[PDB]
């Protein structure tokens with residue numbers, strides 16, 4: 001029953017995870033939050 | 046000098062019309078031929094001269110073949126309507142009570158009208174009245190085909206019409222193209238650039254596909270964008286391969 | 288038919304000529320079928 | 336490369352831009368040396384893609 | 385460099401042109417990312433990698 | 434309904450069209466010979 | 482018929498592939514009175530056939546160019 005919980009947790013995390021975009025000199029919407037995204041991907045792997 | 050030459054210049058159109066209307070079951074074959082051959086001569090010598098006009102033996106043969114087919118269809122329709130409106134069907138009175146002149150005029154108008162320019166149609170109908178008095182041509186309204194055409198036109202942002210409404214002439218041309226497609230296996234659509242030909246045949250193809258349920262496939266070839274060798278094929282001068 | 292049969296009897300070919308639409312190919316085919324022959328029609332061009 | 340701006344030059348610049356913009360085919364007609372290819376090339380530098 | 389300094393326009397014209405093309409492509413891809421900030425929508429962009 | 438009128442209207446239509454063509458061509462030619470207008474490909478062929 | 486086809490395509494097909502389509506519908510609503518029989522475009526096209534051109538004048542060449550740069554105007558908006 002634990003493995004299904006992990007699969008559903010991964011599914012919900014990656015169905016609700018969004019890239020963290022911010023404005024950059026009113027030219028673009030650049031992404032921040034690299035460390036947290038990389039850690040999440042690595043820990044889910 | 047290895048051949049014997051014969052000049053075939055003037056085919057006997059009147060005799061051909063007489064015999065081939067007699068053999069199809071027309072009782073008035075003599076009068077029908079004597080009316081239809083001079084009518085073709087009158088069409089040749091009275092209408093305006095156009096590069097896409099033909100009133101020769103091929104046109105007469107096609108008209109008479111269509112006349113036979115139309116007579117068969119009318120006899121079948123009469124049998125069906127009499128069977129669904131009582132029981133009095135017999136070959137004799139159906140053959141006797143049959144408008145052969147109207148059938149011939151219908152075939153002439155189904156073959157000759159689509160080729161005519163705008164100003165020649167009144168001339169053609171005046172000639173028809175002169176040679177075939179009292180007979181009128183009433184084209185059946187292909188209602189289901191017209192609804193399919195309207196649906197296709199709406200789907201493709203085309204302007205479908207009817208009668209004298211904007212777009213009525215284009216839909217009339219599409220219906221005439223459909224009739225000629227049924228009659229002939231070789232189609233030519235002549236008209237100045239941007240007159241609606243491509244859209245006419247595309248819309249007709251889609252309408253036929255949606256109506257009859259059989260898929261239509263169109264191959265569009267530019268015969269002059271490539272050499273005739275690439276259009277038809279080459280026989281290898283060395284290996285004799287094709 | 289008379290001219291083409293005369294050509295056939297002399298072991299000569301038949302060359303009906305005239306303006307298009309006068310019934311030359313069809314006449315030749317009809318004569319060939321009247322004699323029960325296999326008549327092959329070829330549309331010649333410069334590649335023949 | 337250098338083009339001296341002119342009334343006709345800028346008008347044809349705008350016309351060539353509004354025609355090449357949607358990738359519509361077009362033809363420049365005029366006597367030889369009129370500046371057809373110069374006008375076209377000076378319109379293509381406004382379209383770096 | 386390519387926008388703040390106007391002298392690179394004179395000294396590196398072709399470099400500026402290729403960088404401008406790259407910048408337009410990157411901005412288009414970034415706009416596609418921005419309209420759907422969801423990670424998997426970005427991952428499912430056709431030929432993103 | 435008059436066949437004669439149909440024949441005559443065809444005749445006058447053809448005649449008027451060809452007359453306008455010929456008169457316009459001659460006017461262009463006489464303008465060219467005076468140097469008023471330059472000579473085109475069609476005008477070159479017509480003059481030759 | 483050609484004007485109706487142009488207006489229908491303007492109101493239906495977006496130019497990018499919605500703000501674009503809404504701008505298109507508004508522009509079509511503005512252009513509608515001019516794209517009519519005996520309208521400005523029709524009378525101008527009738528008069529254009531009386532002028533001399535470097536090439537033979539065809540109606541659909543003018544109409545296609547006009548529709549092209551009207552789409553460009555929508556893009557500019």
Ligand SMILES: Nc1ncnc2c1ncn2[C@@H]1O[C@H](COP(=O)(O)OP(=O)(O)OP(=O)(O)O)[C@@H](O)[C@H]1O
Pocket residue numbers: 202203204205212215237238239240241242243244245482483485486541
């Ligand atoms: N029935 C119609 N309703 C609305 N628009 C139409 C209709 N028929 C054609 N058009 C439009 O008008 C133009 C005519 O193009 P079409 O392909 O019909 O011409 P065409 O006669 O085949 O031309 P060409 O021989 O020069 O290729 C096109 O832009 C087409 O979209």
Ligand SMILES: Nc1ncnc2c1ncn2[C@@H]1O[C@H](COP(=O)(O)OP(=O)(O)O)[C@@H](O)[C@H]1O
Pocket residue numbers: 056061102103106306307308309310311312313314
């Ligand atoms: N004696 C005839 N009886 C019936 N049909 C004929 C006769 N002669 C010619 N035709 C018709 O004329 C049409 C054209 O004739 P065809 O032989 O193809 O002309 P061509 O001489 O140019 O080959 C054919 O469809 C044919 O049916």
Ligand SMILES: Nc1ncnc2c1ncn2[C@@H]1O[C@H](COP(=O)(O)OP(=O)(O)O)[C@@H](O)[C@H]1O
Pocket residue numbers: 337338339340341344366367368369370371372373374
């Ligand atoms: N407004 C202008 N500014 C600068 N040069 C011009 C201008 N108009 C014409 N020219 C000159 O005229 C010449 C036009 O030649 P070119 O454009 O090659 O002719 P074509 O377009 O017919 O091939 C160019 O060399 C250009 O220098």
Ligand SMILES: [Mg+2]
Pocket residue numbers: 239242243
């Ligand atoms: Mg076409």
Ligand SMILES: [Mg+2]
Pocket residue numbers: 311312313
């Ligand atoms: Mg033949």
